[PDB]
């Protein structure tokens, strides 16, 4: 199972933020304009408009991938092995061989 890594959004108080580029496995960036975010105390941005938020995210393997995972293999050819019990000389003895 994957995980999406979302860093804190960058919101520019004035003007338009610039979209970057990365090589991350599913990187995706987008710039949204005209935002007007509110924090707990008051408006974050000074002016009522012209504010652009830079939202970016990408995916990455989760921490559980060490333990919780599924392995895809290919089965070429089976090396048969066997274990046998034989009453050799009237006494049970065991033989393990390929």
């Amino acid at each position: 199972e994957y995980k999406t890594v979302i860093p804190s959004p960058y919101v520019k108080c004035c003007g338009t933020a610039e979209c970057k580029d990365k090589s991350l496995p599913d990187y995706s960036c987008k710039v949204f304009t005209g935002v007007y975010p509110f924090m707990w105390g008051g408006a974050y941005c000074f002016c009522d408009t012209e504010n652009t938020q830079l939202s970016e995210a990408h995916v990455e393997k989760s921490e559980s991938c060490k333990t919780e995972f599924a392995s895809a293999y290919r089965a070429h050819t089976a090396s048969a092995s066997a274990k046998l019990r034989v009453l050799y000389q009237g006494n049970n003895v065991t033989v393990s061989a390929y």
């Binding site: 199972e1 994957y2 999406t4 979302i6 959004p9 919101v11 496995p25 599913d26 995706s28 960036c29 987008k30 949204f32 935002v35 007007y36 975010p37 509110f38 924090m39 974050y44 938020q53 939202s55 970016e56 995210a57 990408h58 995916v59 990455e60 393997k61 991938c65 060490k66 995972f69 599924a70 895809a72 293999y73 089965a75 089976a78 066997a82 046998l84 050799y88 000389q89």
Partner: protein, 97 residues
């Protein structure tokens, strides 16, 4: 996306990751600082519920299945050519019997 294998990796400790989950961002909703997105859920969290019966229960010939390593025990197909090399001391002479 969504099906088994949306994210693949060569080894559990490998760093190269290929992931196809069509992650698409979306506009923030009316004066909030969150980052919304629309991503296909995990294909492996889906496969785990959609697994169905494994070979341990569906294999033919009364076949058992184990792991570490993967095996198939007590299959009932075919016959076993068993060749012995019984020493002369093993036999008893016919006059003795």
């Amino acid at each position: 996306p969504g099906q088994f294998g949306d994210i693949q990796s060569r080894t559990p400790e490998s760093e190269d990751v290929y992931a196809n989950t069509q992650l698409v961002l979306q506009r923030p909703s009316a004066g909030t600082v969150h980052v919304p997105y629309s991503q296909a859920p995990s294909g492996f969290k889906y496969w785990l519920k959609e697994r169905g019966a494994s070979l341990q229960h569906t294999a033919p010939f009364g076949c058992q299945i184990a792991t570490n390593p993967v095996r198939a025990m007590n299959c009932a197909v075919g016959n076993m050519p068993i060749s012995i090399d019984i020493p002369d001391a093993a036999f008893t002479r016919v006059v003795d019997a």
